[PDB]
Write a protein that binds this ligand. Structure first.
Ligand SMILES: [Mg+2]
Ligand SMILES: [Mg+2]
Ligand SMILES: [Mg+2]
Ligand SMILES: [Mg+2]
Ligand SMILES: [Mg+2]
Ligand SMILES: [Mg+2]
Ligand SMILES: [Mg+2]
Ligand SMILES: [Mg+2]
Ligand SMILES: [Mg+2]
Ligand SMILES: [Mg+2]
Ligand SMILES: [Mg+2]
Ligand SMILES: [Mg+2]
Ligand SMILES: [Mg+2]
Ligand SMILES: [Mg+2]
Ligand SMILES: [Mg+2]
Ligand SMILES: [Mg+2]
Ligand SMILES: [Mg+2]
Ligand SMILES: [Mg+2]
Ligand SMILES: [Mg+2]
Ligand SMILES: [Mg+2]
Ligand SMILES: [Mg+2]
Ligand SMILES: [Mg+2]
Ligand SMILES: [Mg+2]
Ligand SMILES: [Mg+2]
Ligand SMILES: [Mg+2]
Ligand SMILES: [Mg+2]
Ligand SMILES: [Mg+2]
Ligand SMILES: [Mg+2]
Ligand SMILES: [Mg+2]
Ligand SMILES: [Mg+2]
Ligand SMILES: [Mg+2]
Ligand SMILES: [Mg+2]
Ligand SMILES: [Mg+2]
Ligand SMILES: [Mg+2]
Ligand SMILES: [Mg+2]
Ligand SMILES: [Mg+2]
Ligand SMILES: [Mg+2]
Ligand SMILES: [Mg+2]
Ligand SMILES: [Mg+2]
Ligand SMILES: [Mg+2]
Ligand SMILES: [Mg+2]
Ligand SMILES: [Mg+2]
Ligand SMILES: [Mg+2]
Ligand SMILES: [Mg+2]
Ligand SMILES: [Mg+2]
Ligand SMILES: [Mg+2]
Ligand SMILES: [Mg+2]
Ligand SMILES: [Mg+2]
Ligand SMILES: [Mg+2]
Ligand SMILES: [Mg+2]
Ligand SMILES: [Mg+2]
Ligand SMILES: [Mg+2]
Ligand SMILES: [Mg+2]
Ligand SMILES: [Mg+2]
Ligand SMILES: [Mg+2]
Ligand SMILES: [Mg+2]
Ligand SMILES: [Mg+2]
Ligand SMILES: [Mg+2]
Ligand SMILES: [Mg+2]
Ligand SMILES: [Mg+2]
Ligand SMILES: [Mg+2]
Ligand SMILES: [Mg+2]
Ligand SMILES: [Mg+2]
Ligand SMILES: [Mg+2]
Ligand SMILES: [Mg+2]
Ligand SMILES: [Mg+2]
Ligand SMILES: [Mg+2]
Ligand SMILES: [Mg+2]
Ligand SMILES: [Mg+2]
Ligand SMILES: [Mg+2]
Ligand SMILES: [Mg+2]
Ligand SMILES: [Mg+2]
Ligand SMILES: [Mg+2]
Ligand SMILES: [Mg+2]
Ligand SMILES: [Mg+2]
Ligand SMILES: [Mg+2]
Ligand SMILES: [Mg+2]
Ligand SMILES: [Mg+2]
Ligand SMILES: [Mg+2]
Ligand SMILES: [Mg+2]
Ligand SMILES: [Mg+2]
Ligand SMILES: [Mg+2]
Ligand SMILES: [Mg+2]
Ligand SMILES: [Mg+2]
Ligand SMILES: [Mg+2]
Ligand SMILES: [Mg+2]
Ligand SMILES: [Mg+2]
Ligand SMILES: [Mg+2]
Ligand SMILES: [Mg+2]
Ligand SMILES: [Mg+2]
Ligand SMILES: [Mg+2]
Ligand SMILES: [Mg+2]
Ligand SMILES: [Mg+2]
Ligand SMILES: [Mg+2]
Ligand SMILES: [Mg+2]
Ligand SMILES: [Mg+2]
Ligand SMILES: [Mg+2]
Ligand SMILES: [Mg+2]
Ligand SMILES: [Mg+2]
Ligand SMILES: [Mg+2]
Ligand SMILES: [Mg+2]
Ligand SMILES: [Mg+2]
Ligand SMILES: [Mg+2]
Ligand SMILES: [Mg+2]
Ligand SMILES: [Mg+2]
Ligand SMILES: [Mg+2]
Ligand SMILES: [Mg+2]
Ligand SMILES: [Mg+2]
Ligand SMILES: [Mg+2]
Ligand SMILES: [Mg+2]
Ligand SMILES: [Mg+2]
Ligand SMILES: [Mg+2]
Ligand SMILES: [Mg+2]
Ligand SMILES: [Mg+2]
Ligand SMILES: [Mg+2]
Ligand SMILES: [Mg+2]
Ligand SMILES: [Mg+2]
Ligand SMILES: [Mg+2]
Ligand SMILES: [Mg+2]
Ligand SMILES: [Mg+2]
Ligand SMILES: [Mg+2]
Ligand SMILES: [Mg+2]
Ligand SMILES: [Mg+2]
Ligand SMILES: [Mg+2]
Ligand SMILES: [Mg+2]
Ligand SMILES: [Mg+2]
Ligand SMILES: [Mg+2]
Ligand SMILES: [Mg+2]
Ligand SMILES: [Mg+2]
Ligand SMILES: [Mg+2]
Ligand SMILES: [Mg+2]
Ligand SMILES: [Mg+2]
Ligand SMILES: [Mg+2]
Ligand SMILES: [Mg+2]
Ligand SMILES: [Mg+2]
Ligand SMILES: [Mg+2]
Ligand SMILES: [Mg+2]
Ligand SMILES: [Mg+2]
Ligand SMILES: [Mg+2]
Ligand SMILES: [Mg+2]
Ligand SMILES: [Mg+2]
Ligand SMILES: [Mg+2]
Ligand SMILES: [Mg+2]
Ligand SMILES: [Mg+2]
Ligand SMILES: [Mg+2]
Ligand SMILES: [Mg+2]
Ligand SMILES: [Mg+2]
Ligand SMILES: [Mg+2]
Ligand SMILES: [Mg+2]
Ligand SMILES: [Mg+2]
Ligand SMILES: [Mg+2]
Ligand SMILES: [Mg+2]
Ligand SMILES: [Mg+2]
Ligand SMILES: [Mg+2]
Ligand SMILES: [Mg+2]
Ligand SMILES: [Mg+2]
Ligand SMILES: [Mg+2]
Ligand SMILES: [Mg+2]
Ligand SMILES: [Mg+2]
Ligand SMILES: [Mg+2]
Ligand SMILES: [Mg+2]
Ligand SMILES: [Mg+2]
Ligand SMILES: [Mg+2]
Ligand SMILES: [Mg+2]
Ligand SMILES: [Mg+2]
Ligand SMILES: [Mg+2]
Ligand SMILES: [Mg+2]
Ligand SMILES: [Mg+2]
Ligand SMILES: [Mg+2]
Ligand SMILES: [Mg+2]
Ligand SMILES: [Mg+2]
Ligand SMILES: [Mg+2]
Ligand SMILES: [Mg+2]
Ligand SMILES: [Mg+2]
Ligand SMILES: [Mg+2]
Ligand SMILES: [Mg+2]
Ligand SMILES: [Mg+2]
Ligand SMILES: [Mg+2]
Ligand SMILES: [Mg+2]
Ligand SMILES: [Mg+2]
Ligand SMILES: [Mg+2]
Ligand SMILES: [Mg+2]
Ligand SMILES: [Mg+2]
Ligand SMILES: [Mg+2]
Ligand SMILES: [Mg+2]
Ligand SMILES: [Mg+2]
Ligand SMILES: [Mg+2]
Ligand SMILES: [Mg+2]
Ligand SMILES: [Mg+2]
Ligand SMILES: [Mg+2]
Ligand SMILES: [Mg+2]
Ligand SMILES: [Mg+2]
Ligand SMILES: [Mg+2]
Ligand SMILES: [Mg+2]
Ligand SMILES: [Mg+2]
Ligand SMILES: [Mg+2]
Ligand SMILES: [Mg+2]
Ligand SMILES: [Mg+2]
Ligand SMILES: [Mg+2]
Ligand SMILES: [Mg+2]
Ligand SMILES: [Mg+2]
Ligand SMILES: [Mg+2]
Ligand SMILES: [Mg+2]
Ligand SMILES: [Mg+2]
Ligand SMILES: [Mg+2]
Ligand SMILES: [Mg+2]
Ligand SMILES: [Mg+2]
Ligand SMILES: [Mg+2]
Ligand SMILES: [Mg+2]
Ligand SMILES: [Mg+2]
Ligand SMILES: [Mg+2]
Ligand SMILES: [Mg+2]
Ligand SMILES: [Mg+2]
Ligand SMILES: [Mg+2]
Ligand SMILES: [Mg+2]
Ligand SMILES: [Mg+2]
Ligand SMILES: [Mg+2]
Ligand SMILES: [Mg+2]
Ligand SMILES: [Mg+2]
Ligand SMILES: [Mg+2]
Ligand SMILES: [Mg+2]
Ligand SMILES: [Mg+2]
Ligand SMILES: [Mg+2]
Ligand SMILES: [Mg+2]
Ligand SMILES: [Mg+2]
Ligand SMILES: [Mg+2]
Ligand SMILES: [Mg+2]
Ligand SMILES: [Mg+2]
Ligand SMILES: [Zn+2]
Lengths: 59, 118, 204, 122, 131
RNA sequence: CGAUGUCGGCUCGUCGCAUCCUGGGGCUGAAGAAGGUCCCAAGGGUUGGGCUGUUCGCCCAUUAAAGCGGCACGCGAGCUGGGUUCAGAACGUCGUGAGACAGUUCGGUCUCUAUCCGCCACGGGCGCAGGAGGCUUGAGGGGGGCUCUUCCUAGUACGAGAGGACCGGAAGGGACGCACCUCUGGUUUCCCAGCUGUCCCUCCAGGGGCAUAAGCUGGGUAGCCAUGUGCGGAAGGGAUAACCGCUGAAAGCAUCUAAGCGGGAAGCCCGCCCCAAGAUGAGGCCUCCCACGGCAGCCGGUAAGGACCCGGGAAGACCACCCGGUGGAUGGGCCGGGGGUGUAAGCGCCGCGAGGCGUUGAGCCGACCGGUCCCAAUCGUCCGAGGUCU
RNA sequence: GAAUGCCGGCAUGAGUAACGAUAAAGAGGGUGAGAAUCCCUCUCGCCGUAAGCCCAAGGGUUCCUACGCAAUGGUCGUCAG
RNA sequence: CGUGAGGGAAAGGUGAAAAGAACCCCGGGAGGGGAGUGAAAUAGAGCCUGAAACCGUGGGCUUACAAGCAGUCACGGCCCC
C-alpha cells in the first residue's frame, strides 16, 4: 500500500454530524417487586438479593 | 457462516477450552455456587449436568468416566455420595444460571451465578 | 395461474422406472382463502392464501379483524398468488398432479457478508509466486483518470443469500394428499423448515 | 476424470503401454474426459515393434477411470486405474484384444467392438 | 410437524427388508439387474464390502473385487430395486468400520488381515436350521 | 520535473465496430455440399498447451470461432516484478586512461491504518397530515441472452460420379449462470477408536496432561461445499435492419413509394427472473383504535399498536430480519430415534507370556429428527391517536 | 497572510490504528472507598543446555521494612524496579 | 543531547498587607459548596491584565427533494431594539 492520508481537515460540522449516532441510551431499569429499588430486568436484585420472589444472594 | 453449529469457542483453542470446562466443573462441584461471565456460565450447565447424571448411574464405569474430567477422587466421591442422590427423581436441570446486576469494573463483563439446584 | 404456500421439509430420493430420482419434499396445504383481489376493488386479480394455524393469543386485533371478516381461523402467513382465482375456499396439493412442472420460490440460505470468490466466483489471486496478501482479493476495480470512477453494479463483497429465489420448471414427481405432501424433482431454495411458494411453471 | 497431462494405461495389444492425454475431444473446451469419451494422446511408452510407437499422436477412448462413474440407477462404479483403448477415426479398435474390464457406458456410446473384446463389462 | 417422520413416511414405500445383514469385511455376492439391449439380465458382483454408509433408507454399501487384474469397486443403494438378492459368501472380521486400507494390500496380506469371522459363521449355521 | 511509477503478466472488467463465430441478407465464374465478395447486425460467445520477460509471432491439439481496437499502449494507495535504466561482476567492442555502449551476461529493499468523491453491502433519522397491524400495484432499474453433434425427413432434391441439402422434426452435449446436499466426493480442532515417548493420579488395572495454535494415525454426523444434483438461455407476441415484395402515379411504359399495404435478424420493445412508492409524483386494498383531560400550538394521561429487556435462530460484523418469552417447547439439560466409532470397563475362561475368547454390535457418543416444564425466557417499564384549511 | 519561514498554543485524522511475541487460564477466600489486574489457597498451562542457578562487565540504592497512589506502569491497581 | 571535542533550552508578576480561607458540609483523595479575609477572590495560590485559534452549556432564527470558492443583490417570513 501507499499510506492513505486525509486530503482535507474535517470541518467542525462534518465532524459533529458523524457523531450524530453516538449519544448513549439510558440503562433499562425496572422496580424490584420486593424492595422497589430500580435495577435491570432479568437480574438478581443487587439491593436485596431477591429474584423470582425469593432470596438468592447475601447483599 | 455458523449454520446449526453448536458450542461456544470462548477465544480458547481446543485444549484450553476443555481445561476451562473441567476447571469450572471442579469449582462448581466444590462450592455449589460460583460466579462467572454469562457465556461461560451458560456453557457450563451442560458440561456439569452430564457429570452429575453419570454420578446418578453410580456404577464403576460411570465413576471412571467422570474421573476423566474431574481427576479428584475425593471430589468424585463427594459427587457420588452427597451430590448425586439428591437428584434421584430430578430428570435434568441439575444446574441453574442467574444473571447478576452489576458488571465487572476493569472490563465491563456481565456476570452470572451458576449453582447446583436444590 | 395456480399456486400454494408450503414448507420445505427435506430431501431424499425415490426409485421410478429403475432410476433414482432426487426429490425435495414439500408440505404444501391446506391453504384457506383469506382475501380475493379483484379488478373493481384492487385493480388486479389474485388470491391471498393463508398457511399454518397460529395461537390466537399471538394474533393482534387488526389481524384478527382481517381473519374474522373471512371466517378463517388465525393463520401464521399470508401470501398472494397473482392471477389465481380458485373456485373453492381452500387450496390443497390436489391442484397439482404428478407430471406437471412447477416453479418454486423460497428464501435462499444466508451467507452473510460474502467475499468476491464465494459470491461472484471471482478467481482470486495466486497462492505462491510472490502473491502478497491478495489471495482472495478482487484485483482491479476500474481504469484510471477516464472515467475516474467505478461502475454501478460493480461486483464486490457484501451480503449474499437470504433473498427471494425462484427455481423454474421442476417436475412434480408425486402428490400425497393424505399428508399434504408435494414431491418435486430437484433442488429448492432455502433451509428445511423454510417457507416456499409452488406455482404452475411459466415455461411453455 | 481425465484431462491434458493425465497418464493412462493402454488396455489393448497395440504395443502402447502409457499414453498422455493432450486433448479431450468433447467440443470446444471440455475440462474432463470420462468413460466413453475420446481423447487425443501422445504415446509415452511402448513395447518394441508394435503397431504404435513412442512419439505417436493417437486417439483413444477412455474405458475405465479412477474417478467413480455415476449411473442413473443410483449406483456407481470405480476402477483402480485410468485406462484407454487406442482407436482409429471410425471408433474401431486398432488392436485385436482388450484387457481388463470396461465400463458398460461404452456400449451406449457406440464402441460395440471394444465392449465385446473385453473379458468383463461392469 | 415432524419433518423427519414425513421424510421416513415418503421413504416407507421403497424400503425393503428381504436382504441379509452384513458387515464391512464380509464377502458378498450382489445379484444386480442390468440393461444391455435389447434385454435386461442379472449380473453377479462378488467381493469384499469395504464400507457401509448409513443414512436409513439412503444407506449405501461399497463392494471391492479384482476382475482380470484390475480392482473394481461398486456402490449400491442398500434399498435399490435393481438388487435381486444378496448372498453372504464369507464372514470376515474387521477391526474398523472402513476398510479403505485394503486397496494398497497384496492378496496375501488381505487374507492375513481379514480372517474368517468364526462367531458369525457359526451364527449363520445355527440359523439356517429351520423347520 | 516542491514526482503524472515506466514493459509484460495476473485479476477485474467495460466500451467501439472497420464482425472472428453464431442470426438475417444481395451478387457469384452460386448444380448440391463447401466457398468467394459485399450488405445488416455488438445479444452472447470467442479453448488448452510448447517456445520466449515478451506484447507479438511461430508451432502442437482442438474449435462454431479461436476478431481487431479504446479505456493514462485500462487496471502496481489491486498483486506480480521475468523485461527495462542506480550502486557489484564479466564478455565483445571503443577509449593511452578514468570509463563508455543499450550490445550482451549473473545479481540487485515494490511503503500495515482510506478523509472526500466513486463502488458493494447494512442501518439510524425524518418525511409520505390521525395513530396503527398486515397484504400489495409496478413507474423506473438490474439480471439473462452462447453454441455444437448425431439421428429422422433422405441417401430423397441436385450431381456423370464422388458427394449431398433446403424446410420441418427428435435426441445428446460443451462452457456458463442460479439454487441445492438426496446420491457421489470433500472438510468435519475433540464425535469414536488405535499408537509412541514422558510426567502424573494410585502399585496393578484403568485414566489425565504434553509432544501444534488436534502429538501422531485410521475413520467421521450436522453444517459449509464441487468433483455431485436440479433448473435456466426460451417459447410466444409486437415493431424494425439490410433485403424481398403488393398495389401504384409523377413519367400512356416502368418503378417496393411519391398515397397506401405486406414479408423480414442471435439484434430492438414486451414476455422470464430479481430489486423497487425517498416513484417527495412518497400509489392501492383489508383490518384495528377513537372523536381524552389542561392552558394547522403546547402540556399530560391513554387506545390500537410498538419499543425496551430476556431465550434464541441454516438471520447476522454491530445494526437489521425472524421466532419465542410460563395462556411457553425458545435455548440448556434429560429421554427416544438417527449417526459416528466398531465389541468399553469389570468379571470369567485359555495361554509361561505378549495376547486371545465370551459377556457384547458392546461402550462411548456434537450439531441431525422429535419428546419431555427438570433448568432458564422472573417481575416489569417506557412510548404511542383526539386527526390543518378550501 | 504566505518564506515546505521561526517559537508557542490548539485543532483534523478519531473514540479510529494500537495497547509489544498465540506459554493460557478458572474458581474460592482475604484486603480495600474502589479489585479480571494486590495477597492466600486449589485447579490448569509454559520453560527446564532455561524462561533455573553461580561469576565477570556495565548500572549505582534499583536491596529490606513501614507508610502511600498525583505522576511513572501502554488497562486497572489496594501493587511495584 | 553527544563516546568525545562539542551542542544547549524552557521557565518572571496573588495582595497595600498573608489578612494564604478556622470551622461545618459532599468526597478515599482531588475538587468543590458554605463560612470567613480583602477595596476587589472569574486577586485563591494551576493567582495582575487575560486577546486569538480551539472546546462546551443556554437562547433566537434556520435546516431532512437538495447541486455548493459558500458570498453578493432583491424580496418575503420569524425574533429582537
Ligand atoms: Mg501492497
Ligand atoms: Mg502498494
Ligand atoms: Mg491502502
Ligand atoms: Mg505490504
Ligand atoms: Mg498506511
Ligand atoms: Mg490525500
Ligand atoms: Mg458545534
Ligand atoms: Mg462526517
Ligand atoms: Mg444494604
Ligand atoms: Mg451466515
Ligand atoms: Mg470461518
Ligand atoms: Mg454457537
Ligand atoms: Mg443450536
Ligand atoms: Mg466443545
Ligand atoms: Mg476459539
Ligand atoms: Mg477475546
Ligand atoms: Mg484468553
Ligand atoms: Mg495441545
Ligand atoms: Mg493447553
Ligand atoms: Mg448471544
Ligand atoms: Mg437471569
Ligand atoms: Mg446487565
Ligand atoms: Mg478494576
Ligand atoms: Mg418466502
Ligand atoms: Mg474473495
Ligand atoms: Mg467459488
Ligand atoms: Mg456464487
Ligand atoms: Mg485463479
Ligand atoms: Mg501463479
Ligand atoms: Mg486459486
Ligand atoms: Mg514480496
Ligand atoms: Mg511485502
Ligand atoms: Mg500469503
Ligand atoms: Mg484487489
Ligand atoms: Mg469522470
Ligand atoms: Mg440479508
Ligand atoms: Mg412415484
Ligand atoms: Mg436445509
Ligand atoms: Mg523416439
Ligand atoms: Mg489390463
Ligand atoms: Mg431427514
Ligand atoms: Mg407423519
Ligand atoms: Mg458377466
Ligand atoms: Mg478380492
Ligand atoms: Mg427384480
Ligand atoms: Mg516531471
Ligand atoms: Mg508537495
Ligand atoms: Mg504537488
Ligand atoms: Mg510528491
Ligand atoms: Mg478490451
Ligand atoms: Mg457494420
Ligand atoms: Mg463476423
Ligand atoms: Mg450466414
Ligand atoms: Mg459445384
Ligand atoms: Mg450452397
Ligand atoms: Mg453470402
Ligand atoms: Mg446491400
Ligand atoms: Mg455481438
Ligand atoms: Mg455489449
Ligand atoms: Mg465482442
Ligand atoms: Mg493460444
Ligand atoms: Mg512450461
Ligand atoms: Mg516442459
Ligand atoms: Mg507459456
Ligand atoms: Mg509468447
Ligand atoms: Mg517475437
Ligand atoms: Mg520463424
Ligand atoms: Mg472441426
Ligand atoms: Mg462454422
Ligand atoms: Mg488500449
Ligand atoms: Mg502509444
Ligand atoms: Mg510506446
Ligand atoms: Mg498502461
Ligand atoms: Mg492489450
Ligand atoms: Mg498499468
Ligand atoms: Mg507496487
Ligand atoms: Mg505493471
Ligand atoms: Mg493505480
Ligand atoms: Mg497510487
Ligand atoms: Mg489504487
Ligand atoms: Mg529485475
Ligand atoms: Mg526478488
Ligand atoms: Mg535477467
Ligand atoms: Mg531479453
Ligand atoms: Mg549511491
Ligand atoms: Mg548494478
Ligand atoms: Mg548492471
Ligand atoms: Mg561475462
Ligand atoms: Mg576485450
Ligand atoms: Mg567509447
Ligand atoms: Mg562500442
Ligand atoms: Mg585503443
Ligand atoms: Mg585497448
Ligand atoms: Mg552518458
Ligand atoms: Mg552497460
Ligand atoms: Mg544505458
Ligand atoms: Mg556476456
Ligand atoms: Mg541470489
Ligand atoms: Mg540483470
Ligand atoms: Mg529502506
Ligand atoms: Mg508509509
Ligand atoms: Mg485506522
Ligand atoms: Mg471513508
Ligand atoms: Mg472529493
Ligand atoms: Mg430506512
Ligand atoms: Mg430506521
Ligand atoms: Mg393498483
Ligand atoms: Mg418496468
Ligand atoms: Mg430514480
Ligand atoms: Mg430489461
Ligand atoms: Mg438416408
Ligand atoms: Mg442420378
Ligand atoms: Mg432443421
Ligand atoms: Mg441445449
Ligand atoms: Mg446429509
Ligand atoms: Mg455428503
Ligand atoms: Mg451422501
Ligand atoms: Mg463420503
Ligand atoms: Mg473429550
Ligand atoms: Mg500418556
Ligand atoms: Mg509411575
Ligand atoms: Mg502423590
Ligand atoms: Mg498401567
Ligand atoms: Mg504438565
Ligand atoms: Mg512442558
Ligand atoms: Mg503447547
Ligand atoms: Mg489428545
Ligand atoms: Mg503414527
Ligand atoms: Mg476421509
Ligand atoms: Mg481426523
Ligand atoms: Mg459431515
Ligand atoms: Mg461442478
Ligand atoms: Mg412482423
Ligand atoms: Mg418485380
Ligand atoms: Mg408492378
Ligand atoms: Mg419515361
Ligand atoms: Mg409511403
Ligand atoms: Mg409489415
Ligand atoms: Mg414491413
Ligand atoms: Mg412476401
Ligand atoms: Mg438463442
Ligand atoms: Mg417484491
Ligand atoms: Mg409509501
Ligand atoms: Mg412496495
Ligand atoms: Mg422524480
Ligand atoms: Mg402508502
Ligand atoms: Mg401495551
Ligand atoms: Mg444473536
Ligand atoms: Mg451492540
Ligand atoms: Mg419490523
Ligand atoms: Mg413483523
Ligand atoms: Mg416479540
Ligand atoms: Mg413477560
Ligand atoms: Mg402468564
Ligand atoms: Mg425447549
Ligand atoms: Mg429440548
Ligand atoms: Mg439425543
Ligand atoms: Mg442409533
Ligand atoms: Mg448405528
Ligand atoms: Mg470383547
Ligand atoms: Mg493363567
Ligand atoms: Mg443416542
Ligand atoms: Mg420454570
Ligand atoms: Mg405439554
Ligand atoms: Mg418490576
Ligand atoms: Mg504577501
Ligand atoms: Mg506544510
Ligand atoms: Mg509542514
Ligand atoms: Mg501540501
Ligand atoms: Mg512554519
Ligand atoms: Mg506565520
Ligand atoms: Mg516552526
Ligand atoms: Mg506548530
Ligand atoms: Mg486531536
Ligand atoms: Mg495532534
Ligand atoms: Mg467504536
Ligand atoms: Mg474500544
Ligand atoms: Mg477511519
Ligand atoms: Mg477498524
Ligand atoms: Mg506500537
Ligand atoms: Mg483493534
Ligand atoms: Mg504491537
Ligand atoms: Mg500480547
Ligand atoms: Mg478473587
Ligand atoms: Mg473476594
Ligand atoms: Mg484489580
Ligand atoms: Mg481497584
Ligand atoms: Mg493476563
Ligand atoms: Mg497472589
Ligand atoms: Mg534436561
Ligand atoms: Mg543507567
Ligand atoms: Mg539484599
Ligand atoms: Mg528501596
Ligand atoms: Mg505496603
Ligand atoms: Mg499511580
Ligand atoms: Mg491510579
Ligand atoms: Mg489514581
Ligand atoms: Mg503526595
Ligand atoms: Mg501511567
Ligand atoms: Mg495507570
Ligand atoms: Mg509501555
Ligand atoms: Mg490504601
Ligand atoms: Mg515498578
Ligand atoms: Mg522489591
Ligand atoms: Mg555521536
Ligand atoms: Mg551525556
Ligand atoms: Mg554540535
Ligand atoms: Mg530563558
Ligand atoms: Mg509576594
Ligand atoms: Mg503582587
Ligand atoms: Mg473552602
Ligand atoms: Mg473538611
Ligand atoms: Mg471523607
Ligand atoms: Mg464521607
Ligand atoms: Mg479541601
Ligand atoms: Mg461541592
Ligand atoms: Mg467581606
Ligand atoms: Mg472604591
Ligand atoms: Mg475579572
Ligand atoms: Mg483581578
Ligand atoms: Mg500591580
Ligand atoms: Mg488571571
Ligand atoms: Mg483563565
Ligand atoms: Mg447550541
Ligand atoms: Mg423531484
Ligand atoms: Mg423541504
Ligand atoms: Mg443566492
Ligand atoms: Mg427582485
Ligand atoms: Zn430488591
Amino acid at each position: 500500500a501507499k499510506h492513505p492520508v486525509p486530503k482535507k481537515k474535517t470541518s467542525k460540522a462534518r465532524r459533529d454530524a458523524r457523531r450524530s449516532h453516538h449519544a448513549l441510551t439510558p440503562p433499562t431499569l425496572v422496580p424490584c417487586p420486593e424492595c422497589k429499588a430500580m435495577k435491570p430486568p432479568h437480574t438478581v436484585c443487587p439491593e436485596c438479593g431477591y429474584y423470582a420472589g425469593r432470596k438468592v444472594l447475601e447483599v | 457462516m455458523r449454520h446449526l453449529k453448536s458450542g461456544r469457542k470462548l477465544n480458547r483453542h481446543s485444549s484450553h477450552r476443555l481445561a476451562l470446562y473441567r476447571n469450572q466443573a471442579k469449582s462448581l462441584l466444590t462450592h455449589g455456587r460460583i460466579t462467572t461471565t454469562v457465556p461461560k456460565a451458560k456453557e457450563l450447565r451442560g458440561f456439569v449436568d452430564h457429570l452429575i447424571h453419570l454420578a446418578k448411574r453410580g456404577d464403576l464405569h460411570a465413576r471412571r468416566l467422570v474421573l476423566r474430567d474431574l481427576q479428584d477422587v475425593k471430589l468424585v466421591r463427594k459427587l457420588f455420595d452427597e451430590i448425586a442422590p439428591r437428584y434421584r427423581d430430578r430428570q435434568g436441570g441439575y444446574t441453574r444460571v442467574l444473571k447478576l446486576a452489576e458488571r465487572r469494573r476493569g472490563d465491563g463483563a456481565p456476570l452470572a451465578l451458576v449453582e447446583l439446584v436444590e | 395461474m395456480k399456486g400454494i404456500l408450503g414448507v420445505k421439509v427435506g430431501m431424499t430420493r425415490i426409485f421410478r422406472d429403475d432410476r433414482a430420482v432426487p426429490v425435495t419434499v414439500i408440505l404444501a396445504g391446506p391453504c384457506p382463502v383469506v382475501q380475493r383481489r379483484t379488478p373493481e376493488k384492487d385493480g388486479y386479480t389474485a388470491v391471498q392464501l393463508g398457511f399454518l394455524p397460529q395461537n390466537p393469543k399471538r394474533v393482534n386485533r387488526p389481524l384478527k379483524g382481517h381473519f374474522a371478516k373471512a371466517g378463517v381461523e388465525p393463520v401464521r402467513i399470508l401470501r398472494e398468488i397473482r392471477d389465481f382465482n380458485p373456485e373453492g375456499d381452500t387450496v390443497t396439493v390436489e391442484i397439482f398432479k404428478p407430471g406437471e412442472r412447477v416453479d418454486v420460490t423460497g428464501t435462499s440460505k444466508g451467507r452473510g457478508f460474502a467475499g468476491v470468490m464465494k459470491r461472484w466466483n471471482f478467481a482470486g489471486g495466486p497462492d505462491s509466486h510472490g502473491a502478497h496478501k491478495i489471495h482472495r482479493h478482487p484485483g482491479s476495480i476500474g481504469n484510471r483518470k477516464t472515467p475516474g470512477r467505478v461502475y454501478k453494479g460493480k461486483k464486490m463483497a457484501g451480503h449474499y443469500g437470504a433473498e427471494r429465489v425462484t427455481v423454474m420448471n421442476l417436475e412434480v414427481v408425486d402428490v400425497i394428499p393424505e399428508e399434504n405432501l408435494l414431491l418435486v424433482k430437484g433442488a429448492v431454495p432455502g433451509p428445511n423448515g423454510g417457507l416456499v411458494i409452488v406455482r404452475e411453471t411459466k415455461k411453455a | 476424470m481425465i484431462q491434458p497431462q493425465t497418464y493412462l494405461e493402454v488396455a489393448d495389444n497395440t504395443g502402447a503401454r502409457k499414453i498422455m492425454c493432450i486433448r479431450v475431444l468433447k467440443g470446444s473446451n471440455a475440462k474432463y474426459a470420462t468413460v466413453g469419451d475420446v481423447i487425443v494422446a501422445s504415446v509415452k511408452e511402448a513395447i518394441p515393434r508394435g503397431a504404435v510407437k513412442e512419439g505417436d499422436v493417437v486417439k483413444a477412448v477412455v474405458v475405465r477411470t479412477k474417478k467413480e462413474i455415476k449411473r442413473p440407477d443410483g449406483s456407481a462404479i470405480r476402477f483402480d486405474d485410468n485406462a484407454a483403448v487406442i482407436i482409429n477415426n471410425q471408433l474401431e479398435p486398432r488392436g485385436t484384444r482388450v484387457f481388463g474390464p470396461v465400463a458398460r457406458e461404452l456400449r451406449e456410446k457406440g464402441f460395440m467392438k471394444i465392449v465385446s473384446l473385453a473379458p468383463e463389462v461392469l | 410437524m415432524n419433518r423427519g417422520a414425513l421424510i421416513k413416511l415418503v421413504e416407507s414405500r421403497y424400503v425393503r427388508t428381504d436382504l441379509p445383514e452384513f458387515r464391512p469385511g464380509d464377502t458378498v455376492r450382489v445379484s444386480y439387474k442390468v440393461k444391455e439391449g435389447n434385454r435386461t439380465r442379472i449380473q453377479d458382483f462378488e467381493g469384499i464390502v469395504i464400507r457401509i454408509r448409513r443414512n436409513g433408507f439412503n444407506t449405501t454399501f461399497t463392494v471391492r473385487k479384482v476382475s482380470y487384474g484390475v480392482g473394481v469397486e461398486r456402490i449400491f443403494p442398500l434399498h435399490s430395486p435393481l438388487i435381486q438378492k444378496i448372498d453372504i459368501v464369507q464372514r470376515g472380521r474387521a477391526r474398523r468400520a472402513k476398510l479403505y486400507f485394503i486397496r494398497n494390500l497384496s492378496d496375501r496380506e488381505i487374507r492375513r488381515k481379514l480372517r474368517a469371522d468364526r462367531k458369525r459363521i457359526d451364527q449363520d449355521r445355527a440359523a439356517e436350521r429351520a423347520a
